[PDB]
Amino acid sequence: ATLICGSIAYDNIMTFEGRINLSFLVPTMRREFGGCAGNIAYALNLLGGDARMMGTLGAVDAQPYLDRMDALGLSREYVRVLPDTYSAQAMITTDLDNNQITAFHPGAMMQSHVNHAGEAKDIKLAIVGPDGFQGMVQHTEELAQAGVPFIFDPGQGLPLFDGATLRRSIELATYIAVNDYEAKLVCDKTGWSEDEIASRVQALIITRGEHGATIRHRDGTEQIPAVRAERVIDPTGCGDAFRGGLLYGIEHGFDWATAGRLASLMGALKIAHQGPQTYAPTRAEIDARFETAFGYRP
Amino acid sequence: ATLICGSIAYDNIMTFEGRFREHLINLSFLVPTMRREFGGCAGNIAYALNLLGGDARMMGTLGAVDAQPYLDRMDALGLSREYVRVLPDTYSAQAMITTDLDNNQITAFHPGAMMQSHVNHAGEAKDIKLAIVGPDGFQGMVQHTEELAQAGVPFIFDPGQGLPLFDGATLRRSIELATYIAVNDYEAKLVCDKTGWSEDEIASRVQALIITRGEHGATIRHRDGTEQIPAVRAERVIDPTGCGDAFRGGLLYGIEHGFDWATAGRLASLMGALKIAHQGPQTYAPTRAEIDARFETAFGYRP
Numbered sequence: 112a113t114l115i116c117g118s119i120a121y122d123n124i125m126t127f128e129g130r131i132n133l134s135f136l137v138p139t140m141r142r143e144f145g146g147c148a149g150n151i152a153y154a155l156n157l158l159g160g161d162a163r164m165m166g167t168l169g170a171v172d173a174q175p176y177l178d179r180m181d182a183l184g185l186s187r188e189y190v191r192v193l194p195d196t197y198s199a200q201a202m203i204t205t206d207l208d209n210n211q212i213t214a215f216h217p218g219a220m221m222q223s224h225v226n227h228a229g230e231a232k233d234i235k236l237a238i239v240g241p242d243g244f245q246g247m248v249q250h251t252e253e254l255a256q257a258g259v260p261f262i263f264d265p266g267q268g269l270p271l272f273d274g275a276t277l278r279r280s281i282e283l284a285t286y287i288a289v290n291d292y293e294a295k296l297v298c299d300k301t302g303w304s305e306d307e308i309a310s311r312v313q314a315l316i317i318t319r320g321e322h323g324a325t326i327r328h329r330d331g332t333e334q335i336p337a338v339r340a341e342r343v344i345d346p347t348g349c350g351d352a353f354r355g356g357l358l359y360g361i362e363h364g365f366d367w368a369t370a371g372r373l374a375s376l377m378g379a380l381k382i383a384h385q386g387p388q389t390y391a392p393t394r395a396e397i398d399a400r401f402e403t404a405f406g407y408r409p
Numbered sequence: 410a411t412l413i414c415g416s417i418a419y420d421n422i423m424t425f426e427g428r429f430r431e432h433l434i435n436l437s438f439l440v441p442t443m444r445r446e447f448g449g450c451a452g453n454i455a456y457a458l459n460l461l462g463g464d465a466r467m468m469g470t471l472g473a474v475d476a477q478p479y480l481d482r483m484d485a486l487g488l489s490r491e492y493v494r495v496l497p498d499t500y501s502a503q504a505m506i507t508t509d510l511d512n513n514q515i516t517a518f519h520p521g522a523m524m525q526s527h528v529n530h531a532g533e534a535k536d537i538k539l540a541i542v543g544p545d546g547f548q549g550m551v552q553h554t555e556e557l558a559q560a561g562v563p564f565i566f567d568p569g570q571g572l573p574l575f576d577g578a579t580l581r582r583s584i585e586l587a588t589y590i591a592v593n594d595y596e597a598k599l600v601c602d603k604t605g606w607s608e609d610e611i612a613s614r615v616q617a618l619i620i621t622r623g624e625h626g627a628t629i630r631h632r633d634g635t636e637q638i639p640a641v642r643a644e645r646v647i648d649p650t651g652c653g654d655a656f657r658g659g660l661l662y663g664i665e666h667g668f669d670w671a672t673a674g675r676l677a678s679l680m681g682a683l684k685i686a687h688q689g690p691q692t693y694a695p696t697r698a699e700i701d702a703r704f705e706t707a708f709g710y711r712p
């Protein structure tokens with residue numbers, strides 16, 4: 112199984128019909144299931160992987176997410192629901208041109224360190240994604256002492272790290288996945304160059320938006336092509352769908368060329384739909400699309 | 410009675426520890442505390458006028474999904490709901506309000522039932538001697554100005570957060586119909602630019618142009634002269650949300666009771682100072698005896 116550590120949240124995707132006491136009218140709001148862990152586990156589950164979400168919800172409003180996990184067949188064994196607490200929510204204000212500004216209200220995510228990654232059974236692989244700060248650190252420590260290889264994916268939690276804690280997390284990590292902005296930020300905060308970050312992991316994966324991705328590993332760098340999206344509706348969750356694809360690859364022994372292409376394809380499917388988890392390809396569809404884009408079958 | 414037309418909304422108020430000025434964009438920031446409060450321009454102004462012992466009749470729309478807490482609060486306050494319309498199968502307006510270290514604010518405002526505010530007709534309201542038209546659904550704002558003018562009810566035009574929805578021609582017309590205009594100093598500039606009128610030109614078309622200046626008080630530009638209104642020192646500074654509306658409540662009370670502009674402005678300034686010492690727009694709760702005594706303390710005389 113794969114252990115998916117990160118936020119579990121409701122996303123409120125608010126649309127500003129355009130692009131000091133200033134208001135912006137947002138006539139439409141759409142509520143969606145989100146959170147980094149929920150999004151990545153959704154992607155891995157689409158592929159037929161066995162995803163075990165580890166994260167915290169708040170009892171006040173956890174139930175829809177729990178019912179959705181049950182409907183999807185996603186195990187709830189490491190999802191802790193905290194009494195008298197609200198679930199994390201992302202207030203995602205989006206304009207005309209898909210740019211976004213999020214106010215994230217962490218709620219129960221602030222207590223994510225109540226879950227201990229080192230107690231999880233039959234975990235072969237993990238990811239440590241954006242979450243409560245204490246929980247992110249704790250999971251990297253417990254997975255390393257447990258000998259479970261993990262992707263470190265600090266994402267929106269990067270500003271909670273200082274130099275020392277971020278360098279330590281990279282030492283412990285087996286892989287790192289980031290976008291280019293985040294790669295720069297990791298470089299700046301650690302005082303390490305990109306070469307030096309890459310030297311400390313089996314692979315450093317950098318997504319390049321609509322232009323595919325780069326996978327740097329010890330003796331080479333893979334350039335991963337993008338896949339042309341069928342329509343561009345909403346980027347929220349693209350990174351996470353990519354990461355679901357990448358983890359499926361790693362767990363199933365794919366080479367980096369293939370793992371990266373699968374991850375690129377999941378990103379491209381995601382962007383054609385509103386919200387992080389409303390794309391719903393079948394595994395047969397994913398295989399056919401992979402062949403159409405790349406000329407071979409995973 | 411005084412007809413108070415404007416938004417009725419629930420406010421969700423968050424602080425940001427930075428300054429907005431120094432902060433395909435994918436921007437995410439942590440908001441660790443949020444406080445929910447009763448808000449909306451009409452609810453806030455009516456709350457202020459009612460603190461003073463005025464007879465405030467709110468005119469605005471709520472949504473039936475979640476209106477009940479606000480209707481119960483109105484009833485507990487003794488605020489008439491005669492012109493508060495609750496729209497089936499609709500959500501009430503919600504403001505998502507973030508305040509920075511300089512006390513500037515950015516709001517994402519989800520209008521919900523506010524977009525239907527023109528279902529209320531201000532010209533049908535009975536026993537109304539004065540009114541304000543504050544930020545609301547655009548169609549509602551324009552219709553209330555038209556119907557109040559047609560009915561001969563003197564009103565403050567208070568475009569506020571609604572200003573972006575107005576073009577020059579509509580804003581010029583609205584000022585022509587209005588008896589007073591109230592804006593903050595940033596909004597006064599926006600209005601001068603949109604209309605192509607100077608402040609003096611705008612004041613020539615109303616009985617008074619009232620410009621608030623935050624912690625620096627207010628200016629009332631009128632027929633024969635201009636009053637500079639001092640700020641009142643706050644006892645503590647907790648939240649600016651609703652300061653302008655408290656000020657408007659004080660101003661409406663003074664107008665109704667025939668206060669000179671110097672006194673009406675000072676009362677408004679006092680209400681604003683009391684408001685800022687409390688969270689949200691309506692948690693400040695002075696008594697009328699308190700307001701009279703504070704006014705004497707601050708200003709040297711009784712209103």
Ligand SMILES: O=c1[nH]cnc2c1ncn2[C@@H]1O[C@H](CO)[C@@H](O)[C@H]1O
Pocket residue numbers: 118120121122144145146147150200201213215241242267268347348350351387437438439
């Ligand atoms: O500060 C944060 N911490 C954790 N999760 C976040 C934060 N901001 C946004 N999201 C979550 O990120 C997902 C997209 O990858 C969204 O679904 C949102 O819920």
Ligand SMILES: O=c1[nH]cnc2c1ncn2[C@@H]1O[C@H](CO)[C@@H](O)[C@H]1O
Pocket residue numbers: 134135136416418419420447448449450453503504516518544545570571650651653654690
């Ligand atoms: O765009 C808007 N239209 C109408 N009302 C608004 C808007 N933005 C904020 N508020 C309301 O303004 C009050 C403070 O004066 C707040 O209570 C908020 O609900």
Ligand code: NA
Pocket residue numbers: 266267290350
């Ligand atoms: Na990310």
Ligand code: NA
Pocket residue numbers: 281282283284285286311312313
């Ligand atoms: Na490492």
Ligand code: NA
Pocket residue numbers: 569570593653654
């Ligand atoms: Na205002």
Ligand code: NA
Pocket residue numbers: 584585586587588589614615616
């Ligand atoms: Na006029």
Ligand code: NA
Pocket residue numbers: 604605606
């Ligand atoms: Na002119």
